[PDB]
Amino acid sequence: VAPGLRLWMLIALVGGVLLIMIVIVCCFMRIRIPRTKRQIDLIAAK
Amino acid sequence: VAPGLRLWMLIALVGGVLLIMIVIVCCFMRIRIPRTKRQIDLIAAK
Amino acid sequence: GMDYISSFDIRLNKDVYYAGETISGSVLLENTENIKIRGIRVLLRGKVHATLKVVKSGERRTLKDDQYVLDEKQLLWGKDKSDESDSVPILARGVHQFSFNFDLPQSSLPCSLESRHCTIRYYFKVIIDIPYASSPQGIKYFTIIGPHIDSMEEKYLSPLSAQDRKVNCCWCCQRGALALRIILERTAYVCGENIRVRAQIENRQSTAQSLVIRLVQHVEVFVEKGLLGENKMMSCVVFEHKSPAIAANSQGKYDSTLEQPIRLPVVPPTLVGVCRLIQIYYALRVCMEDEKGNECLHIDFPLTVATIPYRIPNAPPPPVDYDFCSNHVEGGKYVSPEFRLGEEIVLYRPVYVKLADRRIG
Amino acid sequence: TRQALLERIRQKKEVIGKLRCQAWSMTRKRRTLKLAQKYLEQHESKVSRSHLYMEEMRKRARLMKRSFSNFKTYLIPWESKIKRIESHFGSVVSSYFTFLRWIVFVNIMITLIALVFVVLPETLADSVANEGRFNRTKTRKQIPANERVHADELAVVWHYDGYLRYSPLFYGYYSDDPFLGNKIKYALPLAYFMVTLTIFAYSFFAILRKMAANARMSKLSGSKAEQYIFNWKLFTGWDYTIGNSETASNTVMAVVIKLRESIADIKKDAHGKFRLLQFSLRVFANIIICAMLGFSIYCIIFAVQKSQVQDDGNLFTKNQVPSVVSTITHVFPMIFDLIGKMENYHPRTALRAHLGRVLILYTVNYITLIFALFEKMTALRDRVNNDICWETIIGQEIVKLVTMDLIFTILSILVIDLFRGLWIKYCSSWWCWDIETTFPEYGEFKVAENVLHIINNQGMIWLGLFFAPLLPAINNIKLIILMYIRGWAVMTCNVPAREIFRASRSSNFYLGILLIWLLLCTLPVGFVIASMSPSRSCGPFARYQHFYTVVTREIEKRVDQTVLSYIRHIASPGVVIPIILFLILIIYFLFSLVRGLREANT
Amino acid sequence: TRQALLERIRQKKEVIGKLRCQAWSMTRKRRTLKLAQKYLEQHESKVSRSHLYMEEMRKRARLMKRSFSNFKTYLIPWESKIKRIESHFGSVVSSYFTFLRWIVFVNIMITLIALVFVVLPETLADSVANEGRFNRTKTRKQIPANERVHADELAVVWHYDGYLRYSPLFYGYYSDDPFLGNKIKYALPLAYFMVTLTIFAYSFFAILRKMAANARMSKLSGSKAEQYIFNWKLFTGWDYTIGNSETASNTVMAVVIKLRESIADIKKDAHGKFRLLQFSLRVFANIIICAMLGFSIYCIIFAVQKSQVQDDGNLFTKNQVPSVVSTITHVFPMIFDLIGKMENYHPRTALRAHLGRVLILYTVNYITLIFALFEKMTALRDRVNNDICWETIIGQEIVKLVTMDLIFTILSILVIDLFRGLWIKYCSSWWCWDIETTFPEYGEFKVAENVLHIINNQGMIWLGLFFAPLLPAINNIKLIILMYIRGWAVMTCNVPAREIFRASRSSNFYLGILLIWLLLCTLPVGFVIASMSPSRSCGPFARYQHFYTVVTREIEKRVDQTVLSYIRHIASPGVVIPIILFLILIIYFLFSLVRGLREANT
Amino acid sequence: GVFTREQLDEYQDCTFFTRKDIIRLYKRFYALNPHKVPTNMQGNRPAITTLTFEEVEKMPELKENPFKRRICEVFSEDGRGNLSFDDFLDMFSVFSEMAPLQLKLKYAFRIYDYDGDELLGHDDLSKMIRSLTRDELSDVEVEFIIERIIEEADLDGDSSINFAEFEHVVSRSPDFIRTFHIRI
Amino acid sequence: GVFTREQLDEYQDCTFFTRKDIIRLYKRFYALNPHKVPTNMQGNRPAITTLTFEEVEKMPELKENPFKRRICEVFSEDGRGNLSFDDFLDMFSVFSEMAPLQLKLKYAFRIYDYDGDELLGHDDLSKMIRSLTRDELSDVEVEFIIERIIEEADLDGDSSINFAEFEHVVSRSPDFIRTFHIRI
Ligand SMILES: [Ca+2]
Ligand SMILES: [Ca+2]
Ligand SMILES: [Ca+2]
Ligand SMILES: [Ca+2]
Ligand SMILES: [Ca+2]
Ligand SMILES: [Ca+2]
Ligand SMILES: [Ca+2]
């Protein structure tokens, strides 16, 4: 509807469902961005 | 002279002189009114 | 060299001893000519040897590990390796006897067993080191009785009671009920001893049930060599007993001491946490089997195999018979290839204790 | 006789109660319990009926306490999460999460107290409100039609204006009626005042109770300690909580380094060095820190001054001091740590310097914000002198500050930990230099700064819970989000510190900061209640010239005039200053007392 | 070798300082001194000129300190007197005399402070007063010719009227002029206020310093003591200062009795007894003590109320409040001891109970007298309203109370000590029963009661030194007369006690009571300064609506109005009441904290 | 009903664990070895059901503990190499946070010795050093540390630390309760 | 003055006295016996000026003290039965109220022994009790007091009290510095 009264509502709803989806995925996974010190040492040595 | 203006003053000077005399002589002397326990024991024995 | 040694023997006054006792023995060596010998020594070694076969990435890998539990040595004849004297003692031709005495430690020692994946052997190794020739070795095996299990332990004197009931329909309909109650006086038992059981059963089903009791020997072999390590899961039913069938919509009472003796088979003693390299435990499984083979209401008991019965003073004199192990239990079904020379005869085999059956006359 | 039996009973009770403190086996413990039970059974037929009544009452009380403990253990959340963070990262990081869980409990209790007695009665009365009550409360509970068209504009709802400005979230939503309704007789302004007082009282109660529990019953044996360096760094040098291989390896390396450095220092015992460059760097950094603090002061003052509009003329500038303050609170600490590179010394005193600078920054920002808000609001009142509502405006300011703080914290977590970690992982192989072994690193969980964040947020809540009854209720959700995001960030993007020290090595240090901030926050509320004049068109205190009147109007109606006049003379400054002096003197007496006892236990 | 020289100089300094404190043989100390002086002479020519100048300054400072100590030792009076009283009666009786000498020093310092800055410049200005100043202050300095003829009437002078009312001794003699005179510009009212503040400041400083020196620097190891009964009753069981055969024998028998009773108590270890009669007697004694205290309150109130006359209508009844109150303070304690006969128990606790009851009586009499006096003056000022001078009248009441206290104390000493001792000596031979072996005896020195009397008199001095600047000048003479009379009486009429105890066995017990009384006396002077309004016809504060104004008008002349307005709001009740709550909370927390610390120590 | 009402009452009275904690510990015990522990353990089954120290060492709590073997031995029953459910309960209830400082000090001392002579000798402390550091220190450094420890923590000059001396020295450490703690 | 500047400066350094106190002590010392003590006393004279113990015990300050002989013997020089001016001044300088608590404690411990082995044995304390009590207690009473003193004031179980134990025990007494004091 209005670009200043309803576009923000749609953007917020899309952001909310995207945030819920992102939270859900993370909740069932155990991503570990840092690497173990052993492989870091082997990479640094080579 | 006066009964309410000078008689009290005369009594005051008389008492002050008497008290000075009492303080003077007494200070030099070494009177010891209490009696020692030895005298108490001697009296009790007799 | 076989051409130089004429006779080699190891002799003991007794073949089985108890934990903590003093063991005595002798080595007999007979030679015909003078042989230069630096020395002859005797060693005591109790070794656990485990071999586990695994498959990784399509390649078969054999993991071999050893554990030395007993290590005692004593010089019998000759000079030590640190003796720099060149005067080597000479052993005169003929027969010579060397006696030796050792004391077993009071600590718990794992019992001997012979299996494909794990073998525990207590042995004496006599080595006659000889210059410019191969040193002969003589190995003699014996059986160590353990662990030290005493039946007077408070954990074993308490009685055990269990009960269960199952309804095949809606609780409202008491129809189809199956109820069992079992009481045992204790949990520790001696090999060859009768187990006293009492039980009450109520069966309201349309088909008869039989009480199946199975003794399951769980023997787990664990090796440590490896990033993750390899373990062996091994389970067998030692013996199975079936109770008489119970009529439908009826009740019955059961007692081993009154109906028939539930014969416990000659089995190795319970060995839990005495040796790190193998775990052995006994599970008594009780279930009800229908006419169609369906099992339900499984009850598991941990079984303890003790050696000393519950003994009050005025106890009978000790001697009880020694007999050979049964072939239907673990420890007898497999024999190492090094033990068979060529009616099969085995050089060494475990000997267990038993009381002779009721001789009437 | 009777004395012997009483002594035996006391000994048995002492053995039973102290049994949990004896290092005995389970079999021996069970045998002792059975023997005590048999002795109690034997002595049962020895006493009279009254003793049996006391015994059964004690047994029932113990059973009720045990049942309450069992039920309470069912309502304690976030146990597995805390256990996992502990066994992966240690027992010094997890203290933050335990403290946050206790803070959430305190905020839940505060919300319950502020909700059963203020918000719920008012909303219940509004639901069944009559025509007259609606006519009286329309000016405060209904948005005007002129501004209703602009109720949602991505700026009105973001500033808590419009639909939120007339919500139970703010203080002015409530009625002025002394009586909420007939046959119930609920005093609304009195309940409001008493709830505001009781919340502060309960905060003090909880903080002091936890302090006493951690001090007397937990660490009363730590007093009078000296030297014992190797005993402390070797006997209590292993963390039993660690259950990860890399964490254990880092701990082993840290303890080896600690022992080696301690022995190296104790061997040479020589510390002689004087570089003019080092002193110049130290003085330069200490000057620049004060310059940056003054810059923060000027920035917050400029932000509060530029928001000089009361009408809804523009909103792209009124939203500044929400965004300036928070930015500083989240950017200045990190730069502080960078200054620690110039000041190279012992990591323990480096952490102490960092903590001191951060605490000074937070306190200065808080005091300046309060002064600026009060000056601006008094200027607005003077200019306006229907009349504007000031409590609701202050509630707007505080809630906006809290929300922007939460948003900036989320942004900082997503940038410093997540995005930085992904960038390092996927871009350190081909970068210009060895940035994995350089300054950037991976990122370590700073316990001190985050606990200071929590304390500052709770201080803002305490300051602003009078003008907005439903601020603790929002703070519950804020703290839940904070705990979950902190747990995810620490488990997913952070590595254990190679060596970790503590600013105080004491349990009641952060609670000391919390109590200090509670007092610094109860000062302004006290001043506002005592001196400031309520608005005439909003809130339940619009019928009085002072906030406190609603209490004394109750006191003066039930107490005689002569006694009240006699009591009022206590408040004279010349009778009060001696009281303050006496309190300081007795505190000084106890401080010598404390000192003496400490010397004794040495 | 700067480090070696510093270490050597430190070792030499330690050796020099610790020589007097080391338990070495005298020759060993001399040998150490020669070694130290030789090493110092050798080390002299090792350093530069600045170090030599610093050493010269240090040794010159030590020389000044030694010379000052030597000079101070020449101005310490009453040495042989305390020495003889100590050698005759012990080291517990002489504690009262040392305390009284310290009190005399404190009072002399107070008199000097109040005399250099107030009385002397005022009298100097009056001696050179001009015609205008004389015309202005005739109504307050020069006695009217109407009453000048009746200046002495045997009752006017005794009431401090007549020539005494118009002397500097009282408050109203000092002129209202802002400046005493030209070229000096001495602000008399400001000097008055500043001296009144400095008196209390110095009293607090002296009490705190003496307590610190007695506790911190003397018995710092006396804290945390337990058991050690027989060591303390055997190793410290002899008084070394006793030098009389009778006193030595008495203390020998006393220590034998202490050991025997301690062994008897520690052997039997059984305390079981319950008599209804003794409980009834104890409760009756406690009830009659309270009733007798209430009788004291009623008598004081009636005495102040009946003195409703201000003019010289009659003087045989106006002098009934100083006389009656005094006699209570001197007659009520003794009967207390008689009541202690009914409540028989351990002397220690009986003496502690007597001290508590006497302290309660003194505090209640102080409070009631001050309340009645202030109320009577307020009522009389309202009835009369040139205006009457209430401050001068209150000063007259305080001075009359002090003088009547001195007279009654002298009479009590002459009757209880002299007359009773003479009567026993000259009348025990043919008396009806052996009074010498009965309740009378000869008279034992009571240290606690007399120290309490000294403390109470000093309390009256503190309370009344604002309305009478030269009250300490009178109190110096009163204390000197009291000390001489007490010494003569203890030599000539008293006998050593068979067993004398201590209420607390601490050197800072009487000083603690003194500090509490100082606070209790700074309460009403502070209230008078803060609340009451000065008279317009007397004193140098007649030109202000309040006492403290003379300070504020001096602050406001040099301080801007904006900063003054900012600093005013801090004293708001809503900032002070939270401070009181904070101090109460920290007091309770430190009390519990102190408790925990003591538990840990044990 | 795995545990009876009276059994749970005694478990709560002896230890610092509520019913939920006891049930969770039973679940962990079962998950260690499902075959060896029966589903029903009512009675004296906890006293007789044991696991070897190697199996218990595999759990994540004690996996990285340098003194896992010492802890298992100290908290074990009279048997060697066996750890039972009751001893498991005692081990995790002593380590718990709610246990007072005295019990933690007592069991830490009983863990820290090896011979069992109620004294901390040079051999025991050297072995602790070599186990905790993982043989990463030189012998001279280890000896220097041991010498410092004995000289700075002994008042009788016996070169040994007793239980009372231990409780006197290490109870003032603020990190002991934080470190000597296991969450389970 | 009668003393040289060096002499009185040294006396002020070692002792706790000012010029007036030293002059007064000189006057008292002369008053003990006018014949032997010279009026002029500059130089080495105080080191050689000694009098018998009986002359010192005649002054009223220590006349009634039961332990006068022990005090003089403890404060005396190597010579037996002779007390010098320096020893007299040290004796009355430690006893003064200005001397710190440590010095009084040390000299009290030195005085209270009899054999002189720096150890307070049973015989020493028994003799001290018999001197203080003046033989007004039974033998069993003395034995009980001795046993209580030994059992309550011992930490190493040596049946004796050393200087450290004495300081730890009697320095906490609030009546010590008040009693261990003689004004002069
Ligand atoms: Ca982070
Ligand atoms: Ca935050
Ligand atoms: Ca008085
Ligand atoms: Ca007297
Ligand atoms: Ca040991
Ligand atoms: Ca001795
Ligand atoms: Ca000793």
Numbering used by the authors:
A (entry chain D), B (entry chain F): 18 to 63
C (entry chain J): 27 to 368, 382 to 400
D (entry chain A), E (entry chain B): 75 to 459, 664 to 880
F (entry chain C), G (entry chain E): 18 to 201
Question: What's written in the study?
Answer:
Here we report the single-particle cryo-electron microscopy structure of the native transmembrane channel-like protein 1 (TMC-1) mechanosensory transduction complex isolated from Caenorhabditis elegans. The two-fold symmetric complex is composed of two copies each of the pore-forming TMC-1 subunit, the calcium-binding protein CALM-1 and the transmembrane inner ear protein TMIE. CALM-1 makes extensive contacts with the cytoplasmic face of the TMC-1 subunits, whereas the single-pass TMIE subunits reside on the periphery of the complex, poised like the handles of an accordion. Single-particle reconstructions and molecular dynamics simulations show how the mechanosensory transduction complex deforms the membrane bilayer and suggest crucial roles for lipid–protein interactions in the mechanism by which mechanical force is transduced to ion channel gating.
A subset of complexes additionally includes a single arrestin-like protein, arrestin domain protein (ARRD-6), bound to a CALM-1 subunit. A third class includes the auxiliary subunit ARRD-6 and was resolved at 3.5 Å resolution. Upon classification of the single-particle cryo-EM data, we observed a non-two-fold symmetric 3D class defined by an elongated density feature protruding from the CALM-1 auxiliary subunit and we hypothesized that it corresponded to ARRD-6. We fit the predicted structure of ARRD-6 into the corresponding density feature and although the local resolution of the ARRD-6 region is lower than that of central region of the complex, the fit yielded overall correlation coefficients of 0.69 (mask) and 0.65 (volume). Moreover, density features for the ARRD-6 β-sheets are clearly observed at the binding interface with CALM-1, as well as for the crossed elongated loops of the N and C domains at the central crest, further supporting the assignment of the density feature to ARRD-6. We observed a ‘C-edge loop’ structure, positioned at the distal edge of the β-strands in the C domain, a feature which functions as a membrane anchor and is necessary for activation of arrestin39. The C-edge loop of ARRD-6 includes W197 and multiple cysteine residues, the latter of which may be palmitoylated and thus poised for membrane anchoring. Additional contacts between CALM-1 and ARRD-6 involve a loop of CALM-1 (P51–K67) with the β-strands in the C domain of ARRD-6. Structural alignment shows that the TMC-1 conformation within the ARRD-6 complex is most similar to the E conformation. At this juncture, we do not know why we observed only a single ARRD-6 subunit bound to the complex, as there is sufficient space for two.
